[PDB]
Structure 1
Amino acid sequence: SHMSELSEIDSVAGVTIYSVDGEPKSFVYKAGFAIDADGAPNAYAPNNGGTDFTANGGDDQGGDWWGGPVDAEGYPIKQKIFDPFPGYYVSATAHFNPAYSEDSPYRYIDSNSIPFIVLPGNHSNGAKLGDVALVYNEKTGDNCYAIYGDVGPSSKIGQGSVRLAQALKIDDNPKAGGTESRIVVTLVFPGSVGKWETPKRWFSHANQLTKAWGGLSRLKTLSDQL
């Protein structure tokens, strides 16, 4: 394809975020890819039983716990017999399905099964949780549609779900996976969805926007500009 016209709109951690001039509206950045296991129902459990170390969700003994919802005494909610991993903690994502209660793993986006990206807090650049994106790994040639599913630290950029890592052929392990190399190009369509909907529906919408925008071929050429 031809090169795209790019206009800087933001910068986080040395990564420039560009509006892609034209329609449909989109922005793009090239960054590393840290693993966000948030929302996976096996991410966190007592005594380091999860796929991540427990302390990466905070203090599970009544202290500051950010991994997910807590009970009235500040301890993480444990999954029930009707939840995917009974006795593990409920891990939360910023994006959620309103059909389920705050204490339910089903309210959150399962990182193991759903391709999702993280955007830095205070750096959404017009995107709303549930909006779609096209994600491309320039070193493997792999790609995947994804939703904006979680919010990261305001000072960090380039992170996504276990399943997105799998789709991109990046090591998906929450404890040692991901990459610091700036090899992932993320094209976000702000204003595209802005709510929870079934993955079949948002994936189809991502496909329609990507076709209108010029397809992976255009993003491949654009990656050489970043």
Structure 2
Amino acid sequence: GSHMSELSEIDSVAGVTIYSVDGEPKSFVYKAGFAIDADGAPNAYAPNNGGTDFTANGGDDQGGDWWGGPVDAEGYPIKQKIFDPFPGYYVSATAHFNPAYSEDSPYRYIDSNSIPFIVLPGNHSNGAKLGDVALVYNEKTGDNCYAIYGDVGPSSKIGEGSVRLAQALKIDDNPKAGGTESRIVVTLVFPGSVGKWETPKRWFSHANQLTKAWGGLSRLKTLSDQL
């Protein structure tokens, strides 16, 4: 156990209070549910409901409003090539991206299947920039994982992250029926910590260094009981 933390409200979304954690390093925290964001997974979306998510959860794939990823000049989703992970599936995008790759490439986006990432609500980043790191904890399983701020969600919803983060937290990772509405996940974000794409080894190390400086899981576990 650790001492309790001193908390100062900075925001509120969907009945979830977001608190700055007084002290250094600078951080904010919230306790929320955990919806599955399959964005960036190269098998999330395909024609005829072929992906791990239903196609329509990315929008209309017949030239209408498609938000799941990039589109061609006639508005249809880009299909992956023979050198992409899932040829013929659609390219699924995340807000955070790797500039080494082109807009039409799955490799530009953060693969939800492999990378632990959190989503923050649009207009509710609270000073965090895409690529910043976080420590995430599930109070019902005792599991934790470092993660990046990797995607942007609806402004009216909070508590969401990647397939791999769900696995690490022992939350059902299925895009179609997984996640949880129970407010069991505590997310500690370090705004200003990275703010760019870098290798997972590098950002994970930086998350580890910030977490050690901040007081570790022991402090976050105690903090969770305050939320």
Shift of 1:31: 0.1
In structure 1, runs of 5+ residues without a counterpart are: none
Shift of 1:219: 0.0
Helix, strand or coil at the partner of 1:145: strand
Shift of 1:20: 0.1
> For 1:223 and 1:55, how far apart are their aligned partners in 2?
36
> For 1:156 and 1:17, how far apart are their aligned partners in 2?
13
Helix, strand or coil at the partner of 2:223: helix
> For 2:98 and 2:15, how far apart are their aligned partners in 1?
33
> For 2:218 and 2:73, how far apart are their aligned partners in 1?
52
Cα deviation per residue 1:85-117 (whole Å; 9 max; x = unaligned)?
A: 000000000000000000000000000000000
Helix, strand or coil at the partner of 2:145: strand
Indicate the RMSD between aligned Cα atoms, in angstroms.
0.1
> For 1:219 and 1:90, how far apart are their aligned partners in 2?
36
In structure 2, runs of 5+ residues without a counterpart are: none
Cα deviation per residue 1:108-152 (whole Å; 9 max; x = unaligned)?
A: 000000000000000000000000000000000000000000000
Helix, strand or coil at the partner of 2:166: helix
Q: TM-score, normalised by structure 1?
A: 1.00
In the alignment, which residue of structure 2 is the partner of 1:52? 53
Helix, strand or coil at the partner of 2:164: helix
Cα deviation per residue 1:148-173 (whole Å; 9 max; x = unaligned)?
A: 00000000000000000000000000
Shift of 1:41: 0.0
> For 1:117 and 1:36, how far apart are their aligned partners in 2?
9
> For 2:169 and 2:75, how far apart are their aligned partners in 1?
37
Shift of 1:51: 0.1
> For 1:55 and 1:121, how far apart are their aligned partners in 2?
21
Helix, strand or coil at the partner of 2:181: strand
Helix, strand or coil at the partner of 2:212: helix
Shift of 1:196: 0.0
Cα deviation per residue 1:51-91 (whole Å; 9 max; x = unaligned)?
A: 00000000000000000000000000000000000000000
> For 1:225 and 1:201, how far apart are their aligned partners in 2?
31
Helix, strand or coil at the partner of 1:171: coil
Q: TM-score, normalised by structure 2?
A: 1.00
> For 2:115 and 2:31, how far apart are their aligned partners in 1?
21
> For 1:18 and 1:141, how far apart are their aligned partners in 2?
22
Shift of 1:46: 0.0
Shift of 1:25: 0.1
Shift of 1:34: 0.1
